[PDB]
Amino acid sequence: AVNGKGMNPDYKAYLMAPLKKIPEVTNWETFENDLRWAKQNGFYAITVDFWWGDMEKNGDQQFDFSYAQRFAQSVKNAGMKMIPIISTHQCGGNVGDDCNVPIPSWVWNQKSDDSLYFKSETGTVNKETLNPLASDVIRKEYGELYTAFAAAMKPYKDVIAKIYLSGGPAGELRYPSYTTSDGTGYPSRGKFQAYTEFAKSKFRLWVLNKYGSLNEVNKAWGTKLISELAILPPSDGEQFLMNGYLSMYGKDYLEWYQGILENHTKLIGELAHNAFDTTFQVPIGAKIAGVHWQYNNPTIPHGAEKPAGYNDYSHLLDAFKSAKLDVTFTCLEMTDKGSYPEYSMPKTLVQNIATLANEKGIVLNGENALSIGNEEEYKRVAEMAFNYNFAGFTLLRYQDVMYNNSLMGKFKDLLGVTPVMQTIVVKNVPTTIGDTVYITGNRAELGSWDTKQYPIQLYYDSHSNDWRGNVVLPAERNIEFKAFIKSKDGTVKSWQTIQQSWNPVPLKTTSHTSSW
Ligand SMILES: OC[C@H]1O[C@H](O[C@H]2[C@H](O)[C@@H](O)[C@@H](O)O[C@@H]2CO)[C@H](O)[C@@H](O)[C@@H]1O
Ligand SMILES: OC[C@H]1O[C@H](O[C@H]2[C@H](O)[C@@H](O)[C@@H](O)O[C@@H]2CO)[C@H](O)[C@@H](O)[C@@H]1O
Ligand SMILES: OC[C@H]1O[C@H](O[C@H]2[C@H](O)[C@@H](O)[C@@H](O)O[C@@H]2CO)[C@H](O)[C@@H](O)[C@@H]1O
Numbered sequence: 001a002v003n004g005k006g007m008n009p010d011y012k013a014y015l016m017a018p019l020k021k022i023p024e025v026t027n028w029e030t031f032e033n034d035l036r037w038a039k040q041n042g043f044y045a046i047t048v049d050f051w052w053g054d055m056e057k058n059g060d061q062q063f064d065f066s067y068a069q070r071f072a073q074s075v076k077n078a079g080m081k082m083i084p085i086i087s088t089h090q091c092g093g094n095v096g097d098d099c100n101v102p103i104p105s106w107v108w109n110q111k112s113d114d115s116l117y118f119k120s121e122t123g124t125v126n127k128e129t130l131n132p133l134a135s136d137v138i139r140k141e142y143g144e145l146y147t148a149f150a151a152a153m154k155p156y157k158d159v160i161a162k163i164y165l166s167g168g169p170a171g172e173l174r175y176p177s178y179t180t181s182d183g184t185g186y187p188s189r190g191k192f193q194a195y196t197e198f199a200k201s202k203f204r205l206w207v208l209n210k211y212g213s214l215n216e217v218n219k220a221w222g223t224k225l226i227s228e229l230a231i232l233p234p235s236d237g238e239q240f241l242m243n244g245y246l247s248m249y250g251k252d253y254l255e256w257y258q259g260i261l262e263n264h265t266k267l268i269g270e271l272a273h274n275a276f277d278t279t280f281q282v283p284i285g286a287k288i289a290g291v292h293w294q295y296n297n298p299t300i301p302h303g304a305e306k307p308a309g310y311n312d313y314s315h316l317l318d319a320f321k322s323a324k325l326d327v328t329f330t331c332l333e334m335t336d337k338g339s340y341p342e343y344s345m346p347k348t349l350v351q352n353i354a355t356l357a358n359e360k361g362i363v364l365n366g367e368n369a370l371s372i373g374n375e376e377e378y379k380r381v382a383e384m385a386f387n388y389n390f391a392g393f394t395l396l397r398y399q400d401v402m403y404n405n406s407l408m409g410k411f412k413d414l415l416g417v418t419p420v421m422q423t424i425v426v427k428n429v430p431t432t433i434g435d436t437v438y439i440t441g442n443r444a445e446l447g448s449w450d451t452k453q454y455p456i457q458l459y460y461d462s463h464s465n466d467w468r469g470n471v472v473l474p475a476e477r478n479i480e481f482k483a484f485i486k487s488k489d490g491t492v493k494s495w496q497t498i499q500q501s502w503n504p505v506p507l508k509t510t511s512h513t514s515s516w
């Protein structure tokens with residue numbers, strides 16, 4: 001892995017459930033059999049959207065958790081685990097969706113202003129999820145929903161492994177800046193989503209809190225605004241992304257705009273820990289999208305990420321750490337391209353997010369963004385998962401492997417693996433002063449032979465005069481590997497003469513000893 005590490009010993013594979021309710025796909029008894037088959041193929045748990053539109057449909061505090069209870073009882077019957085997602089966003093309208101579950105329609109009547117929804121630069125209204133500016137309504141409604149779900153689901157504590165929150169559209173902490181109705185779908189630039197009158201008022205009040213008075217705002221921004229009502233979000237989003245972002249105004253607007261998501265993360269994490277920690281005592285997570293298009297457009301740099309709310313990932317991740325939420329990044333299977341017109345850099349983006357998460361001590365999980373039809377994309381996922389310290393990978397979605405036995409077996413081989421520590425010992429190594437010793441090998445868990453970025457460090461044992469490492473490996477998979485030496489300057493000096501192998505890596509911890 002990176003940094004001379006190996007794969008995360010906590011790694012688990014998860015399967016996403018269908019977006020529709022199980023009886024719309026298969027009967028409960030077959031579903032139980034399906035869960036046993038997923039378990040045999042290395043899946044630890046099923047993730048499942050429990051839609052707000054299903055659970056509080058008819059009015060405020062009119063709850064119905066019966067579908068989630070029935071689902072959990074079939075998970076229990078199958079000897080499986082589940083990860084509920086408390087899906088306070090709409091099903092329908094985002095990539096891959098095959099469902100139609102708006103959030104409950106009565107929520108929109110809780111305010112007579114425009115505080116609850118989003119409006120884009122060009123006036124497109126989005127009602128996929130509550131606007132995180134409406135923190136009073138979110139505190140009330142999410143707190144009530146999380147508390148009632150916990151009470152209804154307490155009998156199923158034994159099968160709940162983790163709970164996910166929904167921070168925004170498609171279950172991701174973001175603004176709805178890429179949508180067909182707004183003309184901002186992939187691979188286009190995004191539009192900022194802060195043009196309700198309420199969002200304009202909140203930015204204005206934030207700016208006047210920061211600086212005190214309009215006279216100090218103008219000194220800070222180098223502007224000549226005549227009245228406070230001229231404090232506004234960008235009137236020309238394209239120009240803002242071309243060059244306005246560099247100004248003091250631009251840094252303040254992006255700080256505020258991303259800051260709404262950071263504060264929302266704080267709030268939903270407080271609400272979730274209060275609702276769930278005593279009842280369930282499980283990890284709680286939230287998701288960030290991989291907005292990989294327009295990454296390196298030279299004219300509008302990061303022109304889809306910034307409107308989505310992603311201006312500074314380090315600061316965004318710090319909010320997850322503070323809120324005690326684990327992070328899932330949802331686009332792992334793709335390759336960098338970087339070419340006109342999409343300017344798409346998804347692998348660079350997950351490497352950067354993973355590096356930051358690992359730096360900050362945030363448990364990091366991954367998903368694939370689009371359905372996978374080919375083993376090559378599983379190999380891509382494995383490269384990321386097993387070299388960048390991912391604790392989990394969730395496969396979108398159920399039917400793609402449940403009804404494709406060939407592809408299921410490729411998943412089991414490459415990603416449905418159980419980590420096991422093994423001690424690797426290499427004898428008679430001709431190191432000199434300054435040399436370090438590593439292993440590399442064929443599978444992604446061994447860095448796929450990449451000696452530069454991914455090799456696993458061994459350590460001299462002066463009692464035995466050999467080099468040893470306790471390496472986490474995929475149980476019951478075949479591997480080939482070799483030790484090699486790096487000089488002080490980091491260059492590869494020499495290699496173990498003979499290719500080593502384990503056919504397979506044993507299920508239980510032992511050791512593999514070889515000579516150089
Ligand atoms: O400070 C002068 C001017 O700045 C901004 O104008 C932008 C404009 O929005 C873009 O369409 C393009 O014309 O670039 C301008 C910057 O040179 C403000 O939006 C505007 O109010 C202000 O007058
Ligand atoms: O809120 C002040 C001013 O902000 C916007 O103008 C920005 C523009 O968006 C930036 O790209 C850059 O050019 O700086 C401008 C401020 O000097 C709004 O477009 C404008 O209406 C508003 O008055
Ligand atoms: O938020 C939903 C989904 O959006 C992005 O998915 C892209 C996908 O990566 C592209 O290849 C193409 O299909 O457009 C989609 C957006 O409509 C994110 O990459 C993904 O993380 C996120 O879940």
Ligand SMILES: OC[C@H]1O[C@H](O[C@H]2[C@H](O)[C@@H](O)[C@@H](O)O[C@@H]2CO)[C@H](O)[C@@H](O)[C@@H]1O
Binds near residue numbers: 016048094096172331
């Ligand atoms: O069932 C979870 C989640 O799936 C979809 O959103 C995905 C998006 O399609 C993928 O790119 C992905 O791996 O990231 C998002 C979050 O998992 C649905 O659109 C969403 O409603 C649903 O909650």
Ligand SMILES: OC[C@H]1O[C@H](O[C@H]2[C@H](O)[C@@H](O)[C@@H](O)O[C@@H]2CO)[C@H](O)[C@@H](O)[C@@H]1O
Binds near residue numbers: 449482495497499
């Ligand atoms: O690069 C892939 C290649 O890596 C290893 O080959 C080493 C070989 O072991 C060394 O003795 C020397 O020849 O350098 C090679 C890399 O340039 C693996 O042994 C080999 O299986 C794998 O294809």
Ligand SMILES: OC[C@H]1O[C@H](O[C@H]2[C@H](O)[C@@H](O)[C@H](O)O[C@@H]2CO)[C@H](O)[C@@H](O)[C@@H]1O
Binds near residue numbers: 402
């Ligand atoms: O002998 C091969 C496997 O057969 C069954 O697996 C089924 C699984 O039960 C079902 O859910 C899935 O759709 O089809 C596979 C293959 O028919 C046994 O349950 C497995 O243990 C066997 O390995």
Ligand SMILES: OC[C@H]1O[C@@H](O)[C@H](O)[C@@H](O)[C@@H]1O
Binds near residue numbers: 500502512513
């Ligand atoms: O295959 C298992 C055995 O493989 C050999 O390559 C190693 O030298 C042994 O230490 C190991 O127990």
Ligand SMILES: [Ca+2]
Binds near residue numbers: 060140141
């Ligand atoms: Ca309520």
